[PDB]
């Protein structure tokens, strides 16, 4: 006789049979652990309004992503809102901070919008021209434009413009403002006297210029400014303020690095040389009565 071993195995057989049953339950639990998607850090706020100020006036507290719908707007759209501690709500329509986004876009793209919107306001973009038109002229209340610049040394400056508005696509999204309201960055939209021709300042001012892109020329040049400098902007044969220009790391650049020889960087002549590209850039608007 012999089988003092048959019990041995029968033990293990039943043993791990029960082990198996326990393990499947422990597996069912894991399954419940892995049903959720990853947490997306970017969320959209619930309040809505005609613009960001309107949203601010409704108690909105932190800066982030909100949907807004101007009066004439037939469809709501997302925008980044900057809300300070003082209850002011800015609607940001342009941003530059690193060279992440390509600004050499076409008419449709500058019209519809491109780049990305982040809650942390750490992203480059161009809210569509159409959205900027719809916001700035939505009602009687006049808007103010604030151009904020930052060089590669940690210094910042601003340039405010009152009665800011953008025309309908019917008028090629013309840039219009009543007057320069001050700021240590200077009024570059007034053009800059680079010395050459006495018509310098005249052909490098921007107020009242229609928007242009390589494929939709509306500048005061015989050639194509946007095409050469590679961007979308209110050209005038051509510019003294060009915040949608090529992003140059370190700011310093020359005509030897440019494709056509002209300054196509992110410049603001009245604050830095045209051969100095900004490190960061912000174009935001807010009801004029909010600054007074």
């Amino acid at each position: 006789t012999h089988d003092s071993s048959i019990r041995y195995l029968q033990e293990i057989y039943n043993s791990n049979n029960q082990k198996i049953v326990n393990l499947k339950e422990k597996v069912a639990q894991l399954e419940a652990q892995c049903q959720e998607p990853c947490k997306d850090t970017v969320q959209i706020h619930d309040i809505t309004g005609k613009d960001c100020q309107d949203i601010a006036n409704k108690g909105a507290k932190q800066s982030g992503l909100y949907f807004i719908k101007p009066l004439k707007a037939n469809q709501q759209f997302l925008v980044y809102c900057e809300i300070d501690g003082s209850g002011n709500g800015w609607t940001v329509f342009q941003k530059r901070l690193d060279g992440s986004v390509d600004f050499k876009k076409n008419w449709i793209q500058y019209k519809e919008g491109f780049g990305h919107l982040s809650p942390t306001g750490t992203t480059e973009f161009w809210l569509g021209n159409e959205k900027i038109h719809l916001i700035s002229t939505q009602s009687a209340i006049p808007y103010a434009l604030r151009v904020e610049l930052e060089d590669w040394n940690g210094r910042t400056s601003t340039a405010d413009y009152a009665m800011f508005k953008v025309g309908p696509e019917a008028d090629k999204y013309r840039l219009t403002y009543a007057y320069f309201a001050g700021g240590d960055a200077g009024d570059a939209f007034d053009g800059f006297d680079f010395g050459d021709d006495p018509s310098d300042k005249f052909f490098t001012s921007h107020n009242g210029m229609q928007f242009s892109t390589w494929d939709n020329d509306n500048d005061k040049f015989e050639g194509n400014c946007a095409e050469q400098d590679g961007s979308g902007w209110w050209m005038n044969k051509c510019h003294a303020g060009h915040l949608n220009g090529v992003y140059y790391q370190g700011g310093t650049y020359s005509k030897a690095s440019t494709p056509n020889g002209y300054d196509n960087g992110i410049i603001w002549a009245t604050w830095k040389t045209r051969w100095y590209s900004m490190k960061k850039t912000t174009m935001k608007i807010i009801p004029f009565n909010r600054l007074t």
Partner: peptide, 4 residues
């Protein structure tokens, strides 16, 4: 800049 200006284009002469």
């Amino acid at each position: 800049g200006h284009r002469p």
